[PDB]
């Protein structure tokens, strides 16, 4: 049994998705109610691999909302994640993806040292962040978008916004060693983490966001932003490819214009219909086929029988792990989401 632990992107989305399912009690209430709400299994999932193997899974709603962080409800947010993980273990789920901000909260607030949740002791090998698969998928999306637009990736500039993060640092390593990208712009908040990533990569310029934007042919957005920034088209090159891998989306608005291509980063599409409701709630273009890559990782781990915390922690993702999850990804029938033309 695999598990998917996620959360909604806003209170308005949470109230809308609740009302659209039968959950009217959650649709009528505000932040304080969500702050005390328990985790809930709200979807049963069956997936068939291209190899024919059938797996089963469950979606767990954590009831975390990004506004909790802006309202500084840091302890609330911590409980949402720990209660959701405890819920997965109590129900005997073998491997669960910590989607979206639940993995970020887990790391930023050192939740490893809080692993006793009521009568439960969390077993970290039953969880993955899914970040290895997300980093792999985003790299394939860069590669394919470049071929699709007639851009030579070895002659082009890629800016990685969030380059010090777990996903961002993996993408940088693969863009360097497997794609031979022309040049790499590293962008992030922590100077020391940037300095260290530049050393370990042996290349890349460090630039603030406002100076990275106008220089980039591709911008990979993998920043841990609760909110989403507003980018004016006029500041960007033409053509520019925005790969927005954030959840919530790093692009707080629709960036549309001449020579601007926006791609939902870290999304895969399956060769078979999947019977479930949660990707409709997530506004995938094809909600019966498409899903976030971190959730696909949990499916891959269950397909392969790799019941372990395959993606864990921060900055531990290696090229060989990305290659391994990527081969499993193709084999079981997943393909990276491509530019929509």
């Amino acid at each position: 049994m695999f598990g998917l632990i996620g959360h909604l992107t806003s209170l308005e989305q949470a109230r809308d998705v609740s009302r659209r399912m039968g959950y009217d009690e959650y649709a009528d209430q505000g932040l304080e109610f969500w702050s005390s709400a328990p985790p809930q299994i709200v979807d049963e999932i069956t997936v068939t691999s291209a190899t024919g193997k059938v797996i089963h899974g469950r979606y767990i709603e954590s009831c975390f909302l990004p506004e909790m962080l802006a309202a500084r409800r840091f302890k609330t947010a911590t409980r949402k994640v720990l209660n959701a993980m405890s819920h997965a273990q109590k129900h005997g789920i073998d491997i669960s993806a910590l989607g979206g901000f639940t993995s970020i909260i887990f790391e930023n607030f050192d939740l490893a040292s809080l692993r006793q949740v009521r009568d439960t002791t969390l077993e970290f090998e039953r969880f993955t962040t899914g970040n290895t698969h997300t980093a792999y998928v985003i790299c394939r999306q860069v590669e394919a978008a470049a071929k699709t637009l007639g851009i030579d990736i070895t002659q082009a500039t890629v800016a990685v916004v969030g380059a010090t993060g777990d996903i961002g640092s993996a993408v940088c390593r693969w863009l360097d060693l497997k794609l031979g990208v022309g040049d790499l712009i590293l962008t992030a908040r922590n100077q020391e983490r940037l300095d260290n990533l530049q050393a370990e990569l042996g290349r890349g310029k460090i630039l603030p966001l406002e100076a990275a934007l106008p220089e980039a042919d591709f911008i990979v957005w993998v920043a841990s932003m609760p909110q989403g920034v507003v980018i004016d088209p006029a500041t960007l090159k033409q053509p520019c490819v925005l790969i927005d891998g954030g959840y919530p989306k790093n692009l707080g608005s629709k960036v549309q214009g001449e020579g601007i291509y926006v791609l939902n980063g870290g999304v895969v599409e399956h060769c078979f219909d999947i019977d479930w409701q949660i990707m409709s709630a997530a506004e995938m273009a094809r909600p019966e086929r498409q899903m976030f890559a971190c959730f696909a990782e949990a499916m891959l781990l269950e397909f392969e029988g790799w019941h372990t915390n395959f993606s864990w922690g921060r900055n531990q993702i290696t090229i060989e792990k990305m290659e391994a999850i990527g081969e499993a990804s193709v084999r079981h029938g997943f393909q990276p989401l491509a530019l929509a033309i």
Partner: protein, 218 residues
């Protein structure tokens, strides 16, 4: 953290609530023993194990130099007492079980869990003893109603509607009180909903049912 000044004021009513709570539990379980003959022995066991908790919390009010306001605590439980006595008088055992082994137990589970990490060392040690018993009392109500689920469902839904809103009123009454002891209302609601939703799932309710039932009155 002080264990000084207002903490004793607040602790007077809280300790009172827990004594009376454990008292109401002793009685409710005795009357259930009459109401269910074929488990009269088993119920009498849980009932006695409750008096032991009451002694334990008497002790907690002792070595912290607190005198518990037994009047306040009796007003605190009046409605649920009133609802219990009337249901038992009418022979409605399904409703009695929900009040005592589901609602009141999960109230205690939530309260004590939240209390332990902010308790002084002595009360914390004792509190940690009781909390695991309460989970076992919960499981008695759980397993009975689970055996008689089809026959009991409608009355459970009715008793949830009649009594769960009292929990919310009670948590509001005692809120800022409980804050002085270092315990947040938000965490109390969550722990209650977690433990109550759990018992309901074991009993047979589905997720949308539990979500409707657990939030009723909130």
């Amino acid at each position: 953290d002080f264990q000084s000044e207002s903490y004793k004021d607040a602790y007077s009513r809280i300790n009172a609530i827990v004594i009376e709570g454990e008292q109401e539990a002793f009685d409710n379980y005795n009357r259930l023993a009459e109401m269910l003959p074929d488990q009269r022995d088993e119920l009498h066991k849980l009932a006695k194990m409750e008096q032991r908790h009451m002694k334990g919390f008497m002790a907690c009010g002792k070595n912290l130099s607190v005198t518990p306001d037994m009047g306040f605590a009796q007003k605190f439980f009046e409605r649920l007492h009133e609802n219990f006595k009337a249901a038992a008088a009418e022979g409605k055992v399904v409703t009695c079980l929900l009040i005592q082994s589901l609602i009141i137990e999960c109230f205690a589970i939530a309260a004590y869990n939240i209390y332990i990490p902010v308790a002084d060392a002595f009360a914390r040690k004792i509190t940690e003893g009781v909390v695991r018993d309460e989970y076992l009392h919960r499981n008695f109500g759980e397993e009975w109603l689970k055996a008689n689920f089809d026959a009991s469902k409608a009355e459970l839904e009715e008793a949830n509607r009649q009594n769960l809103p009292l929990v919310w009123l009670m948590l509001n009454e005692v809120a800022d009180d409980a804050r002085e002891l270092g315990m947040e209302r938000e965490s109390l609601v969550e722990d209650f909903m977690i433990a109550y939703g759990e018992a309901l799932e074991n009993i047979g309710f589905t997720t949308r049912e539990i979500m409707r039932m657990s939030a009723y009155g909130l």
